[PDB]
Amino acid sequence: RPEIVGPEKVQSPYPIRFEGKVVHGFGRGSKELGIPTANISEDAIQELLRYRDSGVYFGYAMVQKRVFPMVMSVGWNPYYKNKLRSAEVHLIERQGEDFYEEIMRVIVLGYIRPELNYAGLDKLIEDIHTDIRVALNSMDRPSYSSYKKDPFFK
Numbered sequence: 001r002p003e004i005v006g007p008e009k010v011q012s013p014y015p016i017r018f019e020g021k022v023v024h025g026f027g028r029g030s031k032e033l034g035i036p037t038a039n040i041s042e043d044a045i046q047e048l049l050r051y052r053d054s055g056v057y058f059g060y061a062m063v064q065k066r067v068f069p070m071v072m073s074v075g076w077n078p079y080y081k082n083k084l085r086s087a088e089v090h091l092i093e094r095q096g097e098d099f100y101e102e103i104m105r106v107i108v109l110g111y112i113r114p115e116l117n118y119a120g121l122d123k124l125i126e127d128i129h130t131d132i133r134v135a136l137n138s139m140d141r142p143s144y145s146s147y148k149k150d151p152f153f154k
């Protein structure tokens with residue numbers, strides 16, 4: 001795995017902007033697993049990411065008036081056959097209370113990798129830490145980091 005992904009400058013189809021209410025996940029408490037994930041409201045990503053690649057992306061997200069670099073996992077809902085999009089966001093390097101029912105605004109700046117077949121909790125923790133390390137290295141570049149002051153976050 002590479003320690004950095006994407007071009008030096010943001011390229012189409014990024015940036016991709018949207019917002020959604022943070023709702024409860026599916027029971028799996030990631031907060032204790034050291035990797036809390038914010039399940040975005042399904043009614044805001046269905047069409048927008050319907051034809052986007054499943055996988056982990058990166059960029060910036062805002063909630064409770066604060067912007068943080070982030071990693072987003074985009075997959076499908078398992079409870080149904082018909083393709084139902086799902087998205088979960090992990091705000092990187094944040095300290096605070098939970099923000100359920102709060103509107104989160106997201107700016108996707110790039111793709112990291114496709115969804116790896118689930119292979120246990122430990123491996124998944126390892127994969128996500130690398131993801132976080134990659135997102136930071138990727139957004140340390142001017143073209144990407146300036147999006148932290150994007151009008152959408154104003």
Ligand SMILES: Cc1cc2nc3c(=O)[nH]c(=O)nc-3n(C[C@H](O)[C@H](O)[C@H](O)COP(=O)(O)O)c2cc1C
Nearest residue numbers: 025026028037056071072073088090115116117118
């Ligand atoms: C940034 C990130 C990347 C992830 N990558 C993978 C992956 O490659 N493969 C996988 O099976 N699960 C991956 N996961 C875990 C799933 O999202 C996990 O099953 C999650 O528990 C599902 O949502 P729930 O906790 O609300 O049930 C990832 C999670 C995040 C936040």
Ligand SMILES: Nc1ncnc2c1ncn2[C@@H]1O[C@H](COP(=O)(O)OP(=O)(O)O)[C@@H](O)[C@H]1O
Nearest residue numbers: 024025028029030031036038090091098099100
């Ligand atoms: N840095 C963070 N990134 C993402 N979510 C966070 C973060 N800090 C706190 N949270 C909270 O953690 C919650 C997810 O924790 P979790 O135990 O997995 O509950 P759920 O299984 O319903 O998603 C989010 O809904 C959010 O309110």
